């Protein structure tokens, strides 16, 4: 019998890094899951599962919520079973899931003279990454027999790169903030149900 934590996460200065997603669990509370759909402040909204206006009778028990900031034109790579040459190397999602992803503008706060350079993203560490797993590999990419070990030789380049955006953002390449929720129903007691 308490207010849900949904109001303590939205409208935050920062959430996490590009290659760092934090999983959170919703505490016991009572609320309606159709409030987000009624809101007109989320222009972008895409997902799979029951319709927003009907997913109320079947109360969820398990909630997995993540939030991050990415490039605006990455919506093409946010889809189930994606086989993009870059997406799988950083993020991957399976087709057997029921959940919804929303995105909105991120330039309202991440704007200043000289652009933004705090965000970093990886390119390649060893091979394609399976979904639901992360690793921190500091080893430099190897493209030959002699181990460069940080030497700028044999195509040994730094795998991580930072964003760059001018305050005069034009085309939709400007960064966006993306939040993804997944709901799982089980016979175990449900934290939220009514």
């Amino acid at each position, epitope marked *: 019998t308490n207010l849900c934590p949904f109001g303590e996460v939205f409208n935050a200065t920062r959430f996490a890094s590009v290659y*760092a997603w934090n999983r*959170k669990r919703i505490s016991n509370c009572v609320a309606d899951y159709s409030v987000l759909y009624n809101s007109a402040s989320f222009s972008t909204f895409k997902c799979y599962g029951v319709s927003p206006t009907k997913l109320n009778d079947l109360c969820f028990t398990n909630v997995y919520a993540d939030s991050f900031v990415i490039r605006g034109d990455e919506v093409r790579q946010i889809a189930p079973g994606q086989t993009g040459k870059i997406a799988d190397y950083n993020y991957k999602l399976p087709d057997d899931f029921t959940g919804c992803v929303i995105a909105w503008n991120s330039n309202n706060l991440d704007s200043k003279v000289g652009g933004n350079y705090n965000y970093l993203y990886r390119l390649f560490r060893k091979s394609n990454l399976k979904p639901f797993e*992360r690793d921190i590999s500091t080893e430099i990419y190897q493209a030959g027999s002699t181990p460069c070990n940080g030497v700028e030789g044999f195509n040994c380049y730094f795998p991580l790169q930072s964003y760059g955006f001018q305050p005069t953002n034009g085309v939709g390449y400007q960064p966006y903030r993306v939040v993804v929720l997944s709901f799982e129903l089980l016979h175990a007691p449900a934290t939220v149900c009514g």
Partner: nanobody, 123 residues
């Protein structure tokens, strides 16, 4: 949270002093689990100084930190106060000062206002 990492000091350093370390995390009761990551130990070799992750998590034995060095980590008040050990002159006493943040995933690390790793210092 402090970037400077150092260990305790016995009479060898002119007197007995309390440990100087801080624990970084969202809350003191973030989680009840035992684990660790690289957490570069004193010297070139890197070992798990302490896998407790909270107040008396679980005893862990490592070559870098053997029975000669106390194995305990406390996240209360983001500070360390437990005495390490009564060593003998002509020795080294350096202890890592860091802690994990709050997150369900493994290898938790503070994001937003923290940088990977910390400065290496000795007493």
């Amino acid at each position: 949270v402090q970037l400077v990492e150092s260990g305790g000091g016995l009479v060898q350093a002119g007197g007995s002093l309390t440990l100087t370390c801080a624990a970084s995390g969202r809350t003191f009761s973030s989680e009840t689990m035992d684990m660790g990551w690289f957490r570069q130990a004193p010297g070139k070799e890197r070992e798990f100084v302490a896998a407790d992750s909270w107040n008396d998590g679980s005893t862990y034995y490592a070559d870098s930190v053997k029975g000669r060095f106390t194995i305990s980590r406390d996240s209360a008040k983001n500070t360390l106060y437990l005495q390490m050990n009564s060593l003998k002159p002509e020795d080294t006493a350096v202890y890592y000062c860091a802690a994990e943040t709050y997150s369900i995933y493994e290898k938790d690390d503070s994001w937003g206002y923290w940088g990977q790793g910390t400065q290496v210092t000795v007493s």
